[PDB]
Amino acid sequence: GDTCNEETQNLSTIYLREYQSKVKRQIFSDYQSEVDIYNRI
């Protein structure tokens, strides 16, 4: 029944959300500033 269109929309969304994380891993990483852990501790 709707399980179909609800399953469809769900496998699709989980396909989306995981791809949206690949992209975030690309672009948000530009902003990652490393730290001198030996400096602050």
């Binding site: 902003y31 990652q32 500033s33 602050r40 501790i41």
Partner: protein, 103 residues
């Protein structure tokens, strides 16, 4: 140890929780003498700071302070919504004690 920012904030004196549910609008970083600090503002009009490493901080806090300024820079740069802020209200702008974000 506590499990939420709200429980964290209340073991403290002169603290208060603010609900933001918004991304940081402005970010100001200053290396000016005796004013090394970060100031952030939200479109709501609120302004908070990460204070100057003075004596009102026990030694262990010094490494936590630097960590907080890294977080605020990357949050502002990425546009991540900040949910709540636990602040010290005895000074202006309010001091940031803890921060939380949810996805």
């Amino acid at each position: 140890a506590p499990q939420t920012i709200t429980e964290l904030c209340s073991e403290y004196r002169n603290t208060q929780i603010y609900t933001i549910n918004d991304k940081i609008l402005s970010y100001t970083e200053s290396m000016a003498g005796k004013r090394e600090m970060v100031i952030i503002t939200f479109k709501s009009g609120e302004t908070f700071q990460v204070e100057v490493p003075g004596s009102q901080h026990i030694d262990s806090q010094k490494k936590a302070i630097e960590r907080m300024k890294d977080t605020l820079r990357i949050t502002y740069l990425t546009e991540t919504k900040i949910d709540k802020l636990c602040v010290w209200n005895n000074k202006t702008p309010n001091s940031i004690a803890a921060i939380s974000m949810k996805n």
